[PDB]
Amino acid sequence: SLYNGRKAPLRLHILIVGCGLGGLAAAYCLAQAGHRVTVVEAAHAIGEVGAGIQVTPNVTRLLRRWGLADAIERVAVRPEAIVFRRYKTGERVGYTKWGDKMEEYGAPYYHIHRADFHKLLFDLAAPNMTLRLKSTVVGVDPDAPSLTLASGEVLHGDVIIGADGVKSYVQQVVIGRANPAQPTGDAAYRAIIPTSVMLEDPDLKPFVDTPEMTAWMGPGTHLMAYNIRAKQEFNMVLLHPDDGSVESWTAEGSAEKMRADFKDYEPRVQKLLQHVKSTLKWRLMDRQPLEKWVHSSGRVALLGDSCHPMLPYRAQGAAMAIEDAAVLGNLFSRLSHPSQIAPLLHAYQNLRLKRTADTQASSRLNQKIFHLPDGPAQEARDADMRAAMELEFRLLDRKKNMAQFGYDADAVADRWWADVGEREIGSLGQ
């Protein structure tokens, strides 16, 4: 029971465009808040798709609140540390202890396969939503409001939530255009190998025995690797200069070109990439924060990657989409009169926008540091990492980590409601 058992005295029909991690989180939170939810999804079925997702303590805190504590512990992995390595030799130049140290933010840091994460949120939301698959939204009347599907079917609701991802259709209706996207010059390969083949190699086995997030830093390139799916699968993300790619979750890369691009990395990376049977490739595109997330009619708003997508350096996409849902559901649990619908959507945006813009920036400002060419700049980064690492080992920015990881979406919305919203929004209609 979320919201201390409270249900909005005014029950809405809310249409959610997109059955991704955001849309499912929104469907769960808004149904719990006392609203009728329909989720409309383009995909014909939910598939075994996607790769590793970061579940930082600020996300885990909410998933535990939603009753998922055992189910996530079962399928996700708790990384013990983040380790930075020189590409060529595998020298460990950096180390930050995670594991139990992450519990000081009030919940564990998990690594999860997107499909396992999707399944957890799907099973939560499914009993309290109507899901329409094979239903591409191709039009929005933001005044009614209503949605138009590719079939021409029109769906009516009180509120439309656009959770339709990085290439949101709803975003174009809210803002009046697609948010400009600028190529960074880089692409990412994503590839998964079974950990059974690593356990068979005495040089690779320790990567399964002691689950870490390892970043090998190279000239123009990096390889980030970690266990998912209860250490049955090893997730690898490889950043490299864009030699032709598209911004799509289904676009393929050449495993042979991937191996060629990383041929100068240490022998354990050669052995890891030898097991890659296939790889998907994504063109990195930089997007700025939106000016607003709410349409001028106050009945359509955005959630998740539709309004704050970010680069894979600090992939907090899932985190920010789930936080968005928790705050939106918290505010909507308060609704008692139609005159409050717009103010509540404005409050949602007001509580979320700067935080998510700062989180996009945190990812954006990590693009060059792991890709330095060999030389003075590279040796100074390694030296700075070593200094920090040696303190970590003697025991055997933190304030930014606390601002990200210690965040409680419900606490922020409960406090705003108590200090301001009850008086300024709750009284509307009296």
Ligand X SMILES: Cc1cc2nc3c(=O)[nH]c(=O)nc-3n(C[C@H](O)[C@H](O)[C@H](O)COP(=O)(O)OP(=O)(O)OC[C@H]3O[C@@H](n4cnc5c(N)ncnc54)[C@H](O)[C@@H]3O)c2cc1C
Closest to ligand X by CB, 360 vs 378, is 360
C-alpha of 363 from chain center: 12
Could you give the C-alpha distances from 63 to 18, 46, 378, 405, in angstroms and in order? Answer: 20, 21, 39, 14
For the CB of residue 37, give the shortest distance to ligand X in the complex, in Å: 15
Closest to ligand X by CB, 49 vs 420, is 49
For the CB of residue 109, give the shortest distance to ligand X in the complex, in Å: 16
Q: Which residues bind ligand X (CB under 6 A)?
A: 17-23, 40-43, 49-51, 53, 114, 136-137, 163-165, 169, 190, 249, 304-306, 312, 315, 317-318, 321
Closest to ligand X by CB, 173 vs 385, is 173
Of 177, 229, 231, 175, the C-alpha closest to 208 is 231
Closest to ligand X by CB, 94 vs 304, is 304
Contacts 24+ apart (CB under 8 A), 155-159: 155/15, 155/38, 155/40, 156/13, 157/12, 157/13, 157/14, 157/15, 157/38, 158/12, 158/13, 158/14, 158/299, 158/341, 159/12, 159/13, 159/14, 159/15, 159/299, 159/300, 159/301, 159/341, 159/345
Residue 306, amino acid: S
Closest to ligand X by CB, 42 vs 335, is 42
For the CB of residue 293, give the shortest distance to ligand X in the complex, in Å: 12
Closest to ligand X by CB, 237 vs 413, is 237
- Alpha carbon distance 117, 21 (integer Å): 8
For the CB of residue 284, give the shortest distance to ligand X in the complex, in Å: 11
For the CB of residue 45, give the shortest distance to ligand X in the complex, in Å: 11
- Alpha carbon distance 149, 135 (integer Å): 6
Closest to ligand X by CB, 113 vs 371, is 113
The tally of CA atoms less than 13 A away on the side-chain side of residue 389 is: 16
Of 362, 377, 366, 349, the C-alpha closest to 174 is 349
Of 121, 81, 315, 102, the C-alpha closest to 206 is 81
For the CB of residue 3, give the shortest distance to ligand X in the complex, in Å: 22
Closest to ligand X by CB, 19 vs 29, is 19
For the CB of residue 192, give the shortest distance to ligand X in the complex, in Å: 9
For 376-406, b/e burial (b = at least 16 CB within 10 A) is eebeebbeebeeebeeeeeeeeeeeeeebbe
Closest to ligand X by CB, 93 vs 322, is 322
Closest to ligand X by CB, 4 vs 250, is 250
For the CB of residue 76, give the shortest distance to ligand X in the complex, in Å: 14
Of 423, 350, 334, the C-alpha closest to 3 is 334
Could you give the C-alpha distances from 100 to 203, 292, 369, 430, in angstroms and in order? Answer: 26, 38, 27, 50
- Alpha carbon distance 367, 58 (integer Å): 23
Strands 279-287 and 252-253, by their bridges, are antiparallel
**How is residue 83 written in tokens?**
């380790």
For the CB of residue 367, give the shortest distance to ligand X in the complex, in Å: 15
For the CB of residue 173, give the shortest distance to ligand X in the complex, in Å: 11
Closest to ligand X by CB, 13 vs 381, is 13
Largest interatomic CA distance in the chain? 71
For the CB of residue 300, give the shortest distance to ligand X in the complex, in Å: 13
